[PDB]
């Protein structure tokens, strides 16, 4: 029993971190066969990131400006490729460590490991989610850029986030892994800032399935609600609506609880109108939203 | 910045898991050069946990009586012992992967990662704390036995948590990594639960540091506390006493931030007093205890 913010073992992940050095700038690397993914903002000087032109700053650099370290053994680049906002450095040698991967650009509200990096050395591991509008709450300092984010099925690395920079609330702003950004944010020094946030619903829901699970029941009641008349409640509490797809992926959590869907709504609803009195649900005095409901099933099953 | 509850990377502890098998059970051991680190309770039946001679138990087994698999490869076992509370496979092969490590007993307060395993495969990684009462709050299920705590220092595994049982309140306990349990727990079949516990008062205080540091302030007030006032009331909310060793160690946290430690006390008191009236501290409505000064300096600092 138990329930913890769990991250995926970052083995597979750790043997693929590099440093990448461009001038007087180093950051991370993801060393996947023979080709290095690093965020392109790392050719810029800051004056460059004014308003940057990154064809044209590209265009003036050669491969012998990038410099990849693994650690002791230097790698030498052989070419050189831009995609999207992500710089691609091919390099003579592939990595032997290379796991099964895939690239997945994940939906708001999805969650995923980060491993935290610098100067090509993982200095720790936790969990994250994307937030809906599109920011993650990472734990992140200068050095960190290039630290990607990954989810594990079976044997296969779906790497789906890279951290590019931190926004002024101190959230942070990445893309996926061919180089696209979540949300409208871009690789400029610009006045750009995280919109307004909401919680996401059927994170809640699976959340309060996995008290149940382990052993809390304080907070259900006897009551039903409709889709429609709960969505009017999260709408007020500035709560992610709950659509049919939400209820149909809470079905198995529904199904090993004996709980409707619509009755941990109910449940949720009074949590929301009421507060929790002073008690606390799996440790945490808030509602928790960083949990989805694979993510119960995994931890809660195994 | 940012701050959240960071685990160490896993990959040098994932590279040691292996699958132990006695019999009818099985469970996860710690494969060390050409030595296993298993539970001994694997050679026990379950009705030999009632009143278990570990001695009289194990010298009725033999060496062919361990399965040792290592992923696909099945490990032959060429010698057993036991030393306290675990058992000891010696195996023909040394692991290839094996890391620096050093075998450590914690004090309670002190935090570790735990790399969840079943069937010597890695599931998850999770930060934990020892309580003063001596179990920790971990997430295992049925198959977990064997999975280990460790810490990282540099190139370093300092293992210090193997996984035996759970208790009654769902919390959890095991020994070092060489046998000896922590705090009054046995492993046999009897009534034994948890203690009463205590909130870690030093961690507490770092963790307030560590809200200082990401740009948080409204906790502070303009008062100072002496070290026997404070612990008047650390007393009164089932805190851990604050010694001097404490205030030494959040030396650097205090110096960074400017806050003076007994400063940091009197805000603690006034939080205890008064509650937190619906604020939050670090995405928190708790006030949260298991990070140590070293924890808050590492990821406030990288
Ligand atoms: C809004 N700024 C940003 O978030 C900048 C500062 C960021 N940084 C980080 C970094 C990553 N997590 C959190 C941080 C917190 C404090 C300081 C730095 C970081 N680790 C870095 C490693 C190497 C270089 C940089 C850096 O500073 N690069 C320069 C060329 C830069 C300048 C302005 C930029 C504006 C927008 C986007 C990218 C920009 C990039 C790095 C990118
Ligand atoms: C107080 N019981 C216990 O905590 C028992 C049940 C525990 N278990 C776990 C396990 C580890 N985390 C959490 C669990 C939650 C639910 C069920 C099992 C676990 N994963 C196991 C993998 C293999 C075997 C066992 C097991 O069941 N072994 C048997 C011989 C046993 C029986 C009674 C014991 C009493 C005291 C100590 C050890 C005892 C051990 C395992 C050891």
């Known amino acids: 029993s138990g329930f ?19 001038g007087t700038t180093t950051l991370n690397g993801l060393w996947l066969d023979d080709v290095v993914y690093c965020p392109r903002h790392v050719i810029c000087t800051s004056e460059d990131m004014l308003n940057p032109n990154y064809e044209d700053l590209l265009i003036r650099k050669s491969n012998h400006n ?5 650690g002791n053994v230097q790698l030498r680049v052989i070419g050189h490729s831009m995609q ?3 710089l691609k450095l091919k390099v003579d040698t592939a990595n032997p460590k290379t796991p099964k991967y895939k690239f997945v650009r994940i939906q708001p509200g999805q969650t995923f490991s980060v491993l935290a990096c610098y100067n090509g050395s993982p200095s720790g591991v936790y969990q994250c989610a994307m937030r809906p509008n ?3 709450k990472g734990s992140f300092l200068n050095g960190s850029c290039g630290s990607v984010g990954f989810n594990i099925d079976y044997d296969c690395v779906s790497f789906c986030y890279m951290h590019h920079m931190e926004l002024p609330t101190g959230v942070h702003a990445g893309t996926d892994l061919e180089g696209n950004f979540y949300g409208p944010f871009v690789d400029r020094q610009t006045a750009q800032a995280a919109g307004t946030d909401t919680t996401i619903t059927v994170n809640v829901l699976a959340w309060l399935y996995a008290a149940v699970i382990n052993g809390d029941r304080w907070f259900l009641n006897r009551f039903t609600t409709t889709l429609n008349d709960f969505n009017l409640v999260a709408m007020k509490y500035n709560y992610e609506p709950l659509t049919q797809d939400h209820v149909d992926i809470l079905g198995p959590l529904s199904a090993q609880t004996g709980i409707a869907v619509l009755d941990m709504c109910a449940s949720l609803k009074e949590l929301l109108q009421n507060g929790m009195n002073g008690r606390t649900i799996l440790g945490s005095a808030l ?14 099953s195994g």
Request: a negative charge; charged letters at 20%; hydrophobic letters at 45%.
């Open 84 to 86: 999207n906002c992500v």
């Open 287 to 300: 509602l928790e939203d960083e949990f989805t409901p694979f993510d119960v099933v995994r931890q809660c």
């Open 66 to 70: 990038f410099l990849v370290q693994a």
């Open 4 to 22: 913890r913010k769990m991250a995926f073992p970052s083995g597979k992940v750790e043997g693929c971190m590099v440093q990448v050095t461009c």
């Open 134 to 136: 599109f920011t993650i």
